[PDB]
């Protein structure tokens, strides 16, 4: 149980992780299925038990690296899984290795997810930091207080559309 294995039960075969849950099959129903008619649980042909079938651990491999002109350092990201295979750190999107978690939040550089961005900084490596939304600005407010510009700046912005 609780491991990735190739199981063959009665005339049913499959591959996944067997875990006993609190589900209860009808005494005349050996096999369960999901909405897609894929088996999510089985009953052992010998002993009477309810074993939920969870598929084996898998996910996406997200390679986080600066450009070839910058550095060869790479931060490997796994999706929707904790650290299993494997500076091994965990994030909200999954197990993220190769990057260092930083409490100080900076401007987003390489997008990851769940409000996490990566960058190559300081003896320099890749760091995994919380995405900053910009500098906090507290604007004072009052009945008689007002800000009228005493000077202006003409700036030409470049918009590019295909």
């Amino acid at each position: 149980k609780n491991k990735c294995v190739n199981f063959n039960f009665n005339g049913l075969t499959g591959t996944g992780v067997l875990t006993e849950s609190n589900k209860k099959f009808l005494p005349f129903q050996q096999f369960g299925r999901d909405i897609a008619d894929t088996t999510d649980a089985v009953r052992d042909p010998q002993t009477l038990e309810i074993l939920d079938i969870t598929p084996c651990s898998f996910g996406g491999v997200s390679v986080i690296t600066p450009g070839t002109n910058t550095s060869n350092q790479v931060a490997v990201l796994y999706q929707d899984v904790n650290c299993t295979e494997v500076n091994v750190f965990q994030t909200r999107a999954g197990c993220l290795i190769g990057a260092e978690h930083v409490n100080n939040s900076y401007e987003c550089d390489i997008p990851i997810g769940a409000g996490i961005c990566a960058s190559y900084q300081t003896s320099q490596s890749i760091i995994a930091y919380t995405m900053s939304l910009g500098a906090e600005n507290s604007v004072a407010y009052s009945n008689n207080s007002i800000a009228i510009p005493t000077n202006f700046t003409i700036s030409v912005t470049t918009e590019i559309l295909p």
Binding site: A93, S142, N143, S145
Partner: protein, 318 residues
């Protein structure tokens, strides 16, 4: 604004846990590699949509400790720090009225989390709401400029043709008209759940397409069986490759049908995302001299509200 990010693996979906079947999939070349890049570009554009819409400013504007609303009641639109997650009382209803995925994401597809969390998206709206209450019309086009909210409704009448003398005299009567308008919205969203159905349709559109793609694995697609290992056991390896080829071809048509819809639905969302980016620019940030772009009535100032996989606009109109 944001559509559910889904990255489907064509290696696992087409051929479940089969190397010999994967050899038949390699006979089709980049079809697998190409379908992955199409869904990947969707997940990237949905993250670009939230950046081009939710955040119109590079600074976080917050409300002062002393809150002077000019007679209005902004406690509904402004976030509450007492809650563990920062959100407005209205956005709290927006998260609840908008709601298996765990079973399908174990079938060889992956639902990617958004780049901006709901707490960060709410701070974008918190920066826009606190700005319009304090900085008003200035902060959209440049640095924030503090202006009293009692005077922030004065020029907005001057833009729609009403002389601002009406505001200062009727400000007491407008305080009752605005506060009652906000209260009717909270009762409308809480009691009636069909107002947010526009976002529920987007989630139902994705959930139906996700369920549609997964239910196709149980189909025969002309093959004798729907199980790869069962075909390999009942038939010889050369005779099984003919039956497996019918499954692969049928399952590729399932992805090519799903990816086609997602690319088309993304352009539908990007069409609405560009409107949300345009409305927040014209309605929320500035004043709209246009008619019925910000909704019925002469536009004054708009209130953005964070919502799951989208955004809710509150347009104050005259």
């Amino acid at each position: 604004v944001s559509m559910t990010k889904t990255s489907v693996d064509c290696t696992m979906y087409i051929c479940g846990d089969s190397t010999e079947c994967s050899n038949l999939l390699l006979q089709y070349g980049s079809f697998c590699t190409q379908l992955n890049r199409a869904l990947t570009g969707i997940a990237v554009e949905q993250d670009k949509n939230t950046q081009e819409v939710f955040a119109q400013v590079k600074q976080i504007y917050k409300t002062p400790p002393i809150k002077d609303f000019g007679g209005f009641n902004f406690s509904q639109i402004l976030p509450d720090p007492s809650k563990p997650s920062k959100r407005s009382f209205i956005e709290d209803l927006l998260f609840n009225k908008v709601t298996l995925i765990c079973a399908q994401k174990f079938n060889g597809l992956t639902v990617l989390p958004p780049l901006l969390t709901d707490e960060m998206i709410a701070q974008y709206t918190s920066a826009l709401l606190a700005g319009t209450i304090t900085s008003g019309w200035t902060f959209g086009a440049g640095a924030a400029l503090q202006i009293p909210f009692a005077m922030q409704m004065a020029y907005r009448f001057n833009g729609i043709g009403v002389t601002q003398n009406v505001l200062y005299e009727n400000q007491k009567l407008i305080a009752n008209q605005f506060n009652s308008a906000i209260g009717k919205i909270q009762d409308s969203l809480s009691s009636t759940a069909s107002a947010l159905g526009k976002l529920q349709d987007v989630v139902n559109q994705n959930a139906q397409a996700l369920n549609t793609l997964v239910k196709q694995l149980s189909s025969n697609f002309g093959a004798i069986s729907s199980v790869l290992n069962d075909i390999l056991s009942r038939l010889d390896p050369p005779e099984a490759e003919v039956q497996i080829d019918r499954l692969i071809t049928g399952r590729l048509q399932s992805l090519q049908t799903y990816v086609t819809q997602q690319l088309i639905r993304a352009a539908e969302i990007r069409a609405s995302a560009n409107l949300a980016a345009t409305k927040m620019s014209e309605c929320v940030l500035g004043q709209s001299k246009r008619v019925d772009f910000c909704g019925k009535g002469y536009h004054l100032m708009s209130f953005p509200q964070s919502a799951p996989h989208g955004v809710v606009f509150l347009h104050v109109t005259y």
